[PDB]
Amino acid sequence: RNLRDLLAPWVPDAPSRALREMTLDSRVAAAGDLFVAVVGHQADGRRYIPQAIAQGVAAIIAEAKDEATDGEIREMHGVPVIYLSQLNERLSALAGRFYHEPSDNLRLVGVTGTNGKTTTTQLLAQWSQLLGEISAVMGTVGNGLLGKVIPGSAVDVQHELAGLVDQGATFCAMEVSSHGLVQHRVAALKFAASVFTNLSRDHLDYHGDMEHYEAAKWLLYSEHHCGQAIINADDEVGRRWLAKLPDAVAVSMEDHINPNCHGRWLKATEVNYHDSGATIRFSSSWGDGEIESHLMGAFNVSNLLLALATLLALGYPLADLLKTAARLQPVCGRMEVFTAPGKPTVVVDYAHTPDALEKALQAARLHCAGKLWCVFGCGGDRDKGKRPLMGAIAEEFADVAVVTDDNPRTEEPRAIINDILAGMLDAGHAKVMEGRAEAVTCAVMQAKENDVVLVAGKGHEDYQIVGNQRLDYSDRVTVARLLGVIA
């Protein structure tokens, strides 16, 4: 790594300097490093130039605004200071070059939108790896090779992706946050494909506002290497964009494919939501088939179809995708289904808010021939407002509400339960059982073979905080033990 080579595309005849790491933070800027001084929302990195020089950085790249012209080479205490205009916009490209263009050395798929980003990202990584890739994820959960995700500037993005390349990753599914995109944090990444789970957003009822939102985004996307566009046609904005993008792949499970366009497409023709997942019949420009998904609810059908369409667009054979689809797993504690022969279906989900609980019950309902049970509580020593709302939701969208404990902490467990029950029309119809394990056992042991029991609130979070103790407890383990299966 050399300053001269680093800057060659932009600043010819830049000094020759060996560079260790690239950093925006003058605090950690050690000897031999390249310090990058950026002008930010409320901070100006150029302030910390003398400090960085004092810690022995090899060279500095600094925002040119007001202080210099673009590509201006200066020299302070023997250290090169190269000024570049619009450094924020160029930082991704700069870092990309520094870290040997990691997105050109694996298949990078970017997923954007509000809902289903995490799941779709995870399914992309899972499915690609089942097809022979060494897959990785980058996003809100964390970064890492599949099953070793460790819990973010344009430099960090490039740096982490290079780290994954070094660990042998050949495929990376990246969640792209709306904010990350706008702030040019993925500006120079070569995306093999970009998946749009949706492009809708609240607060856009004024026609001028929707117009500006779309223009802003369209402009942004025009400036990125998006690769193959895979768009959810069940989204209103998605459809309008698909109408303008003849090379984009349209995906639908609600009959929004327009075949007159002769574009590439994938649609679910029918779905059977059964006790252990969904059987998805689909047609596509690549051929038709049938997938046995072990994921629950309509949203996860959409998410799966988006991943399928993406991988098909990237040229993975339909037959191989079909042969591996049954091995796709739910994201841990996200509508994770547990079945056993002749037992009720039990779903463990992390849902701990009124909206999450409602969605999880609506999803569970689809797979439920009999009665839908909901076992849940609310956290103690936290905001109490959601309690009656979650009570009301459990009453409305389930057949049997089993109200129990969930991390009561120092608060009186029964008081929390009372707040939950307060929101119900017929609290008397609810079952109350304290001891969460006992409540789960009650639902599971009493529920019929064709019932579904949703156990909500914890998902993967395997502890019960009672008083000051994080006592060892797991919904997944409790459920697995009751059903005679392995969590």
Ligand SMILES: O=S1(=O)CCN(Cc2ccco2)CC1
């Ligand atoms: O830019 S982003 O939208 C996509 C990449 N992510 C993951 C990331 C990289 C380094 C630290 O965290 C940040 C948000």
Ligand SMILES: O=S1(=O)CCN(Cc2ccco2)CC1
């Ligand atoms: O589809 S996009 O995400 C990326 C490409 N851009 C510009 C464009 C349209 C047709 C040719 O170039 C639109 C947004």
